[PDB]
Design an enzyme around this catalytic site. Structure first.
Site, PDB file in Angstrom:
ATOM      1  CG  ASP A  55      57.045 -15.599  71.990  1.00  0.00           C
ATOM      2  OD1 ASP A  55      56.215 -15.563  71.054  1.00  0.00           O
ATOM      3  OD2 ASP A  55      57.755 -16.601  72.231  1.00  0.00           O
ATOM      4  CB  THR A  88      51.775 -18.282  70.139  1.00  0.00           C
ATOM      5  OG1 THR A  88      52.289 -16.997  70.517  1.00  0.00           O
ATOM      6  CG2 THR A  88      52.597 -18.855  69.010  1.00  0.00           C
ATOM      7  CB  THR A  89      48.782 -14.940  73.081  1.00  0.00           C
ATOM      8  OG1 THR A  89      50.177 -14.612  73.174  1.00  0.00           O
ATOM      9  CG2 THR A  89      48.133 -14.693  74.432  1.00  0.00           C
ATOM     10  CG  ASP A 384      56.114 -13.657  66.282  1.00  0.00           C
ATOM     11  OD1 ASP A 384      56.223 -14.889  66.040  1.00  0.00           O
ATOM     12  OD2 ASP A 384      56.110 -13.207  67.448  1.00  0.00           O
TER      13      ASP A 384
END
Ligand SMILES: Nc1ncnc2c1ncn2[C@@H]1O[C@H](COP(=O)(O)OP(=O)(O)O)[C@@H](O)[C@H]1O
Ligand SMILES: Nc1ncnc2c1ncn2[C@@H]1O[C@H](COP(=O)(O)OP(=O)(O)O)[C@@H](O)[C@H]1O
Ligand SMILES: Nc1ncnc2c1ncn2[C@@H]1O[C@H](COP(=O)(O)OP(=O)(O)O)[C@@H](O)[C@H]1O
Ligand SMILES: [Mg+2]
Ligand SMILES: [Mg+2]
Ligand SMILES: [Mg+2]
Lengths: 517, 517, 517
Positions: A55, A88-89, A384
């Site tokens: 994450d 998010t990445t 997620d």
């Protein structure tokens, strides 16, 4: 003096070059985790504590970033996680890439003004392209809703049981979901995660109710109740006192006994008000005197004290019970229902399971795993898995995965670049190129031939269509729709928003003035 | 221990990354001096010494480079300056840039193997293309030779009198040039530079002879000689002594006198051997006794002692005289002719001018200027001027300036890339794009809009053909041929070899191991 | 004290563990330079000096290894380079590899004794198997000789001219080569290498004579002689003195002259003795007085003084002249012949070329190139090329390259391990396996799929035969014989010999005692 010593300052190229470098570094740090083949990181904080994760949000958060521009790169993942929950990445990587290509243009001597404006158009025009190409699906379609969830879990560690976890995640969101105005609205707080080491991730499941980490306050109380009528009491079941300062003055021997019984009475009276409503299970937010526990026990009522305020609310929402402040005004309608309420020693630990509720508006997912690590990462996968399912129900729009949307955005945004033309077109062309690090670092982490791979994918896509992307499991381009490898239309839209905003925010800073870092 | 401490090492990405970066830094240091608008740098050495110049070779040298890969960049300017004499900056810049575009390919995960191979093809194919497009000219075409000389002086400080200086330069190389095999061959060593402060660069002139910084050894010798018969003597005009240790044992008074006389005679016997050839001007490499001086004076001969062996050799080529080791074998077939030989007090500084020589095979260019810096920089200008005039006479081929050749190379090499295809095509395409820094930085140093101006030139050139380049004075594209602005076909052919070799050498190093730098 | 403090000591596990580590570390450092696709290393000594190479021998030597077991790895390369000239990397790699597999057997608790004895048997059987499969060739077969040299040059930087250089090397060795006992015997000391910057590696030529870095001693002497009769005089052409101390005592004026003349005479008679032989070219190892120079000039004789003793012997072997200690005994049969002896100014430096010699027993290879580095590396390439040609002429036996031999040894040496059996068999099997780092690191440095590649090649070899190996240029297995890619049967034999001994040597050290490193 004239300005604080030890305070550094950077301007123009310096400021921009460094900020861009900082951002780029932090970005490359997380890009090794992108996709199903992504690698994990081991974070060892100063207190020895070890965090092993995939994450991005956790990594950027746990890592003690010092450079300002790199801290801003944290906000990007923060906003993404808080708006679409996934990607998010993707957002952080695209933000750094955008910033890199943006410097190329700066070297070329193009005014920052021109680059910013071009990124804006490319950005705004990008949302447009997505809303349009988005595969509008049915807000509650079990079918596609399961896919969205599984594709999210296949990006992290615990992808070994994407099957189970996806089921549970879709199931748990459909249950707490809300749609009285036509479209759904999902308050994810109405889904609690319970983690307990031991067993396998195979034993994880959905508790259509609530699980509380407390135990029955008294030995003689039932450890199990069938059709429980739960009472939620947010009042101290103990000897009340006056606000005005008061003290008892025993004047004769017989007083010692009378006063004690006077209180026993008081205590027994409150408990009576609770027994009369027909309640066989009571959750008290405050304390519970020993005597009150005694009477409560005689009536065969199961009580737990010191229940977490946040727990109280989940019980209210899961059992249909009503929280009360005065036992005196408690009525049988305030009571809630639970097909079963029992104290179970799960992993030598005592917990209470309020399961089998009617139609809970709050539900719990029990995560089981061999190690603390296995668990913590499964919870992260579910959060997620859940946040994305939430996006599809409220949005009713999905896209294919494997860089497929970014490939389309690249190809398309380039045309747009032409029609815009001028210096701006350069920024718009660079922005569109940047979007390729997704397909790029996707095949890269998978150990494939970046250069060659990205050429077959931009080909197939131009031929076969929007559903073509990279399949790190296939090693070749594929129709992501046919493989059910899809993601929320919101995930892409928010990644693009966060990234470009950040990119542009940095591109606008022409001076940095810091004191101690 | 295992490997000496204080010894650093880098591998893979690390090595290349740092080497490329180091080279780039160096390249971008000199690039601000490229073209006629380029800027000068001020260099202050550890000993307070000051050097202001536009010359890459001087800068790369005076600056104390520390990083290994950065010193290898000095080798590039060194090779260039000893092969084409000009375009030192050009070779370096194209090298750094060639490396930058190369790192982009490494990042893309392309094996260093592939990049080197591709850069090799591009570099090889480029010599070929330059050879082809080269405008073959007449080895002594006074015209194009005056241009080549002035196009060079223009790109430096001295461009204020590119007129005079380019003339002095083409004139001086024609004079000492040689050709007995069909083609010319110039030994630039035959052109000496005499720097003297005062006056204006206006007084700089060509001396069809040689200027020497010595004086007339005796007060009563001639300070001027009309039609000088010059003797080049490399023997000491002093009382010779035996190799075998020897000493005189005076035993009677009359011997004090008799011995002194025997030496006078020996001394005079030598001065006689010189006067008898008709020589009225004598240049002696070694020393000259006081008596030998008084005799040379009485015979009305002009003598100079301690003449630099290098000066002796120049007088040998300029006056057609022969150097002799023994005065006894001095025939008049050994004397040389100079129309005038005189001692002038040039700036309070006595000197001997040997001008009006017949057909000197060695000549001298006297330089005048207000400050020491003016002169040194004028001399530097003339050296490149002479060195270029030399490439044309020997090569008999020229090319247009203002980055026209690189633009033509860029364009054509890209097509070559197309037909070569594969990963290499990427290296080749990058190499081609690299070559654009000359036009790019040429316009940049001028103050023009880089991005835009470069689109105009690639256009004109694409339409109006090979002669189109950028003209910093015009601030727009022009036909360099029509403007007369050109450079030797050697300057561009070498810049490419030099730079591409350097680039490939660095791209090949996968491990650096240093002990103290 | 008891044993100097600061004196580390290791035993058994420890000793061997560390020795094997240090050994392997060194080995892995150079294995990246193995094959044609190998990389170069940049070595920066504490004094600044930069060396860029692919040569294992140079790298191990330049680096400052401190660990004992590492320094021993330098001896491997040394012996390899002195017995076969090529394969220095190959031996060091197979050595460290042998030590790796050897420790695997140590951890399995197998007694060092057994590992050593099994390795000796594997080593011994190896030579035998190599002598048998070795492809016997004709000691002077111009064909296979031209291959060997190019195959060798292809494994270094300058392979861009494997063509030119291979020719120069086969040629140069066929010349100086000597054979009167039936078979050949080369003394590579008869091949001088001359390196001069400028030009390209294209102008590299094989001077069938000698190039000397001295110049014509006197101005008036011939700078070029057509058909030279050369005299090699190792005596000082100057006024001899007596061993017995002596000094001249002048008593009368007439003596100053009579003595000087007596010496001139002495000098002149020495020169007369040389002239009387008909010699027009004189090389004098010692000094040459001034007068002696003058007389030598008059006779039109070209003389050079201070020639290196090493140079004199090269001149004697190339021209056929005989060195002489006493001019008095110089006869015309002592002179030698040279078709042309001229003073050429190569790369701004004056040199003397003695080419066109009869049947030179000593020859010079002139190396040209852009930078010092291109030069030094070309020389290194050539020294290996010369050395391999030398092995084949003396041995008259070759082998296929690209790991073909080692694959064959692996495959075969395994069956041998079977017949031996016991613990030995384990040592023999591991030895046979170690030999694979060659095919292995060959494909690895190329960028191929190590694992899969090493399986296709062992397959082919098992099928097609001994000629099957890896071709880093083909990226696939190939029949190295049909390809002309071969190496000296000696190089392989010496690699095994070297590596296995080095390995066994370390496997035998069970205690290490050191005082400061
Ligand atoms: N099977 C797959 N093949 C190729 N790419 C995939 C696959 N599944 C998911 N992806 C991609 O991987 C990315 C998500 O990877 P992940 O490591 O979870 O990071 P992020 O924080 O951006 O979600 C998405 O862009 C998605 O399209
Ligand atoms: N009038 C001009 N207009 C445009 N370019 C020019 C002009 N004169 C010279 N140049 C260019 O400038 C470069 C030479 O600049 P200079 O400062 O002398 O550096 P260098 O060491 O490379 O010769 C060449 O590439 C040449 O084509
Ligand atoms: N064309 C080729 N293809 C595959 N391997 C080759 C080729 N040419 C040479 N080799 C191999 O590379 C090795 C020589 O590489 P090199 O860098 O010079 O190191 P070494 O010091 O061992 O000679 C030899 O083992 C040889 O078999
Ligand atoms: Mg994800
Ligand atoms: Mg110049
Ligand atoms: Mg070799």
């Amino acid at each position: 003096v004239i300005l604080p010593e030890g305070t550094q300052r950077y301007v123009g190229r310096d400021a921009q070059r460094l900020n861009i470098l900082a951002a780029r570094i932090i970005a490359e740090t997380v890009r090794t985790t992108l996709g199903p083949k992504g690698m994990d990181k081991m974070l060892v904080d100063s207190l020895g504590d070890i965090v092993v994760t995939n994450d991005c949000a956790t990594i950027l958060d746990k890592i003690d970033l010092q450079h300002p521009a790199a801290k801003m790169m944290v906000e990007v993942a923060k906003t993404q996680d808080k708006e679409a929950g996934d990607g998010t990445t993707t957002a952080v990587v695209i933000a750094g890439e955008l910033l890199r290509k943006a410097e190329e243009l700066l070297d070329q001597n193009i005014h920052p003004s021109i680059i910013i404006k071009g990124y804006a158009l490319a950005a705004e025009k990008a949302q447009e392209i997505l809303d349009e190409i988005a595969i509008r699906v049915d807000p509650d379609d079990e079918e596609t809703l399961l896919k969205i969830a599984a594709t999210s879990i296949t990006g992290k560690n615990a992808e070994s049981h994407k099957e189970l976890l996806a089921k549970l995640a879709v199931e748990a969101v459909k249950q707490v979901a809300e749609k009285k105005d036509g479209k759904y609205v999902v308050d994810l707080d109405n889904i609690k995660f319970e983690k307990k080491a031991g067993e396998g991730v195979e034993e994880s499941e959905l508790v259509r109710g609530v699980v509380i980490d407390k135990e029955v306050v008294h030995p003689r109380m039932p450890k199990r109740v069938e059709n429980a009528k739960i009472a939620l009491i947010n009042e101290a079941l103990e000897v009340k006192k006056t606000e005005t300062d008061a003290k008892i003055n025993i004047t004769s021997p017989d007083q010692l006994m009378s006063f004690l019984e006077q209180e026993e009475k008081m205590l027994k009276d409150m408990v009576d008000h609770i027994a009369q409503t027909g309640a066989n299970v009571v959750f008290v937010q405050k304390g519970i005197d020993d005597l009150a526990q005694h009477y409560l026990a005689k009536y065969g009522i199961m009580a737990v004290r010191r229940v977490k305020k946040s727990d109280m609310e989940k019980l209210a929402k899961a059992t249909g019970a009503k929280i009360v402040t005065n036992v005196k005004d408690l009525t049988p309608e305030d009571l809630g229902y639970a097909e079963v309420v029992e104290e179970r020693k799960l992993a030598g630990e005592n917990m209470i399971f309020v399961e089998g509720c009617k139609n809970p508006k709050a539900v719990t997912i029990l995560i089981r795993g061999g190690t603390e690590h296995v668990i913590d990462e499964v919870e992260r996968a579910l959060e997620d898995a859940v946040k994305v399912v939430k996006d599809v129900m409220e949005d009713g729009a999905v896209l294919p995965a494997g860089g497929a949307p970014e490939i389309e955005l690249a190809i398309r945004l380039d045309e747009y670049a032409k029609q815009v033309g001028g210096k701006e077109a350069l920024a718009i062309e660079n922005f569109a190129d940047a979007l390729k690090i997704i397909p790029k670092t996707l095949a890269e982490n998978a150990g494939l031939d970046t250069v060659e791979m990205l050429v077959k994918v931009i080909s197939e896509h131009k031929n076969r269509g929007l559903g073509i992307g990279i399949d790190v499991f296939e090693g070749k381009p594929a129709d992501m729709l046919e493989k059910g490898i899809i993601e929320p239309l919101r995930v892409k839209k928010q990644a693009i928003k966060s990234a470009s905003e950040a990119a542009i925010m940095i591109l606008r800073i022409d001076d940095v003035i810091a004191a101690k870092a």
